[PDB]
Each structure stands twice: as C-alpha cells, then as structure tokens.
C-alpha cells in the first residue's frame, strides 16, 4: 500500500502529561531517560524564549539517536521549522563552509506575516496604446500610455498604464478576451486564461477557461505567509521580481551562492523587528539538527563557538558515535565523541543505552507489523537470537527477503525455513570478515 523506509513507525516521544514516559508508546521501546530529556528540550523549544541552546546525543551504533531527533521534529509540529543536516554537507565548492553554516543557522528561524495585497483583476475588454510624438528620439519609449478596460462581476474599470506595466503585461502575452490578475505590490501580472463568455471548442493551444471574477476590480485581501530569515536574505542579495532592468536580468543568469555580508543581515533584522513592532509579524524559532557531527573539522567548530553566542541562534541538536577520537583537521587533540572541549563545555550531553533481548524482540514485532507481514512465534524467537548474536539492523533488514521467500512458495506465514534460507543467501559483517580473512586473492 504505502512505502516504509527505516522509520515511520515512530510518531512521537510518547510521554504522559507530567513528562513520564510509557515503555511502549509512540513507536518507541525503552530509552526512557533519553525520551524524558528530549521532552524537556521540546518544552524548552516551545517556550520560545532562549537563544543558542545546544545538546548532544551520544551513544553507540543502532541505539536510537536519529529516531529521537525525528521524534522531536514530529512532536513539535509542522509550524516550527526543522532543518535536517549531515556534517559532510557543509563542504561546498561555491562558497566557504562558514557561510554555509550561517545560512543553515538562519534557515531555522521562521516568521509568520499577515500581509495585504492590492489587486486589479477582470476580463480584458479593450487594449489601445497611444504613441509618442518622437519615437526615434533616443530617450523615452515608443508609447506613452496604454488604455486597458477591465470588466469583472458587477463592475467595470478603465485603467491608464505607463509603458513599464504594459511591458510586463505583453510579456505575459495578454490578448482581448483573457482574464488577468495585476498585483500592485510588485507589478507582477498573471494571465489566468481565456474567458468562458465566448466559444470554447475552437482552440489549439490547450488553454483553460475561467469564469468572470467576483467582486469589484480593485480589491484588498489579506494573505498569511510563512517565511524564514534566510529567504529574506537570499531575496535581497539577488534581487528578482521587480520590473527594472537589474531584477529582470537577474532571473536569466545562472544562480550562485555568495558570501552574504553582516550589514544585509542587520538591515533585514531591523525591518523584521519593525514588522513585529506593528503587530503584523510573529517570530517562530526552530531546531537545527546536525547529524554525524564528527565529520566537521576544527574551523567549523571554532566558528560554531562564535555562532552559538549570537542573540538570534536556534536550538542545535548534534549526534555522534565515537569514543575518544582525534578531531579532524588536527593531529594531537584527542577528545570524547570527536568534539573539542571548548564546544563540549557549551553542550548538554544526553546518553543513550543499548538494548536487550526482549526490546529487540518487540522492536522486530513492531517493524514486522508495520510492513504488513505475519511472523510465527518460533521464527520471531530465531530472529531475536539472530539479532542479539550479530546486530539489530541485520535482523531488521532480513524481514523482507523472508517475506519474499514465503510469498514465492504460495504462503502467507513466515516460518523458520525462510529465516534459514535468508541466512544462507545473505550474509552480515562478521561472516564477511571471516570469509575475507581466509581467502586467496583479496576477496
């Protein structure tokens, strides 16, 4: 029916109203202390008061680190911006890594704005331009004004435009008998389609047929918009959407990342604070999630120390699975989790713990019942012993070949023989290393 991929049996942290966690709730099994700590972090994010609070999730492989961050994102809801990331993604070839980190910092602070629009709309009834006296004079356009007659439901208006608006109108290829939509905030013109007041079946260019727009031609409507700070920074750094030459040629050239200056961010902050002061906008801080944080080097860590101390930064969540490893970009610095001690001093570490046989067995039960598979009890116990012997993920990933081998024998139940056949056909890391060690020519 649907598609399942390594997750999506997790819907939330599954906590009570007082913060205590049920053992089996929300798709989670075990990890009670980590779930309660993540609930405290979720409440801290929902308080919307703090800036630059950073935690770190530490533990071994297959212990439930990224599942907790995904559960945090599901608990917060879609109105809070959540920016997933991998530590290898900060190494770009177009811009420096510091700018990529600051862009992903600004991408995690949302904004809700109740803005208003001025709209002229209706069906075009006439289109007559008036020429200039000296067309070849070098200065000034060919035309001077264009008379446009618009007709809507219980209304009719006549408009006199400059050549600037008419240039965008004729760029939209507007004829007589079309329904248009002029937005006065930017001069943008949208051609909705042919009107249905005329014949329909005599066209050859797959158009759509639109009724007459209701209400008057001139209108004022309120639109609720959800944007981030990075959207404003990008739209101001590379200007598009105006009717001038510079914003028109900006849509045609190839886009490229640029080092946004601090002055532009300060001006955008000033304008956004002015919008909030009028009661129009409202700030929604969010979460930045950097997975595999050991891939970063010392320069990004040293810039992260500076960037966490700013007065706008969101809540940062990191994850790592290294014991005591050298930091990348250095030679002698040995630190826990691959994170330097000055950054470790600014964190709050949440420990994650390994599982047992019972938790592995019920996790296999949950993953089997998510994937619409029916497993026998003896096969379930065999898979639980397999998971404790080798790996949890190897037992989880062997469910679908077992189901296929059961289906190819015209059967619905998964039995022990299917699990034995899947053991024979597919290997794991330890048996592959055993084959690699006793082999002739670098297998």
């Amino acid at each position: 029916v649907t598609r399942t991929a390594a997750h999506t049996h997790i819907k939330g942290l599954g906590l009570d109203e007082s913060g205590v966690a049920k053992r089996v709730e929300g798709g989670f099994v075990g990890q009670i202390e980590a779930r309660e700590a993540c609930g405290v972090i979720v409440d801290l994010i929902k308080a919307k008061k703090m800036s630059g609070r950073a935690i770190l999730l530490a533990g071994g492989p297959s212990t439930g680190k990224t599942a907790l961050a995904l559960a945090i994102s599901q608990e917060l809801g879609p109105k809070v911006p959540f920016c997933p990331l991998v530590g290898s993604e900060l190494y770009s070839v177009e811009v420096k890594k510091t700018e990529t980190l600051m862009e992903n910092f600004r991408r995690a602070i949302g904004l809700r704005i109740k803005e208003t629009k001025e709209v002229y709309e209706g069906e075009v009834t006439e289109l007559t331009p008036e020429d200039a006296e000296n067309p070849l004079g070098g200065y000034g356009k060919t035309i001077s004004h264009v008379i446009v007659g618009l007709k809507s439901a219980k209304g009719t208006k006549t408009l006199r435009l400059d050549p600037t608006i008419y240039e965008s109108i004729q760029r939209e290829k507007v004829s007589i008998g079309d329904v248009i939509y002029i937005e006065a905030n930017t001069g943008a013109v949208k051609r909705v389609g042919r009107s249905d007041a005329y014949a329909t079946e005599f066209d050859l260019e797959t158009e759509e047929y639109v009724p007459l727009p209701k209400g008057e031609v001139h209108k004022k409507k309120e639109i609720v918009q959800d944007v981030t700070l990075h959207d404003l920074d990008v739209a101001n750094a590379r200007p598009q959407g105006g009717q001038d030459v510079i914003s028109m040629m900006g849509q045609l050239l190839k886009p490229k990342k640029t080092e946004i200056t601090e002055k532009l961010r300060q001006e955008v902050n000033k304008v956004v604070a002015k919008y909030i002061d009028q009661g129009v906008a409202e700030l929604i801080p969010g979460v930045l999630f950097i997975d595999e944080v050991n891939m970063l080097d010392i320069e990004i860590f040293t810039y992260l120390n500076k960037a966490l101390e700013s007065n706008i930064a969101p809540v940062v969540v990191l994850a790592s699975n290294r014991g005591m490893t050298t930091v990348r970009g250095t030679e002698d610095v040995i630190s826990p989790h691959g994170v330097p001690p000055d950054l470790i001093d600014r964190l709050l570490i949440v420990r994650t713990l390994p599982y047992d046989k019972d938790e592995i067995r019920t996790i296999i039960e949950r993953r089997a019942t998510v994937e619409r598979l029916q497993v026998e009890s003896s096969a379930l116990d065999l898979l639980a012993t397999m998971g404790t012997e080798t790996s949890l993920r190897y037992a989880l990933q062997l469910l679908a070949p077992c189901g296929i081998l059961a289906q190819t024998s015209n059967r619905k139940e998964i039995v022990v023989n299917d699990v034995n056949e899947a053991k024979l056909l597919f290997l794991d890391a330890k048996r592959s290393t055993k084959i690699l060690e006793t082999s002739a020519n670098y297998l």
Binding site: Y181, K190, V192, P211
Partner: protein, 136 residues
C-alpha cells in the same frame, strides 16, 4: 498560482466520489436530481458544474415565487437539461419531477419524514424507467 478547481475537487472526498458516477451518468444520457442542505452546499457546486459545463439550474425558496412556475416547466419540457439542484423542502413537496429517476442526497439525514417526501416528488406516476436512488 491561482486557486485550482482540481485541488478543490480532490480535497473533498464526497465531491471526489460525486465526480466519478456523474461521468457515466452523462455517458448514459440520463437525468439527475441532487438535494442539498446549506447555502454553500449549493454555492460551490455550480462552480464544479460550470467546470464540467453541464446544463443546470438551481431552485430554492430564496428565489421568487414566479421562477418556480417556469423552472419546473423548462425542466419537464427540455430534455437537454442535466442537473437540477434542490434544497430539502423547496421542491420536494408536490413538484412533478417524473422526467428523472436518479436522486442523489448530499447530506439528507435530517429526518426520515423529510426524505420520504423528497423522492416522492421524483418517484411518481408517469416515470417510464427504473429509479436508482444514491445516498452519499
């Protein structure tokens, strides 16, 4: 991007199922009556009808008493009319609607007494074919 009729159709499940059987009902060459309850239950549906450019008229008692005299006459005389909208008690009381069989109830669940007169206006003497009642 302007609000899209399709997304308007597909975001409502009742209208989604309504658009399916109407295609084969038109392909059969038939006559359809649909009953309604709210204003906007019959203020959004003719947008869908004009999207399908179906021949339709709307009858309710908010309209004047003169129009009910000739709307029923134009329904019973013209065969090219396809869709006849209605409220509960506006035309389900004494109106001769023997030219159609398929009555479709959008939300007629108010009382069985009201619905028992509703198909009484259609399933009447003079019908020459089978009556298929669809309750949604």
């Amino acid at each position: 991007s302007m609000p899209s009729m399709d997304r308007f159709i597909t975001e409502s499940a009742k209208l989604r199922k309504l658009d399916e059987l109407l295609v084969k009902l038109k392909s059969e060459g038939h006559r359809v009556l649909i009953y309604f309850q709210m204003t906007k239950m019959m203020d959004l549906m003719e947008e869908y009808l004009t999207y399908r450019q179906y021949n339709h008229i709307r009858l309710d008692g908010s309209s004047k008493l003169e129009d009910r005299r000739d709307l029923v006459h134009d329904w019973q005389t013209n065969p090219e009319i396809f869709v006849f909208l209605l409220s509960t008690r506006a035309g389900g009381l004494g109106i001769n609607l023997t030219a159609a069989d398929t009555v479709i109830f959008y939300d007629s669940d108010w009382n069985p007494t009201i619905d028992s007169q509703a198909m009484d206006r259609a399933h009447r003497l003079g019908q020459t074919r089978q009556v298929t009642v669809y309750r949604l």
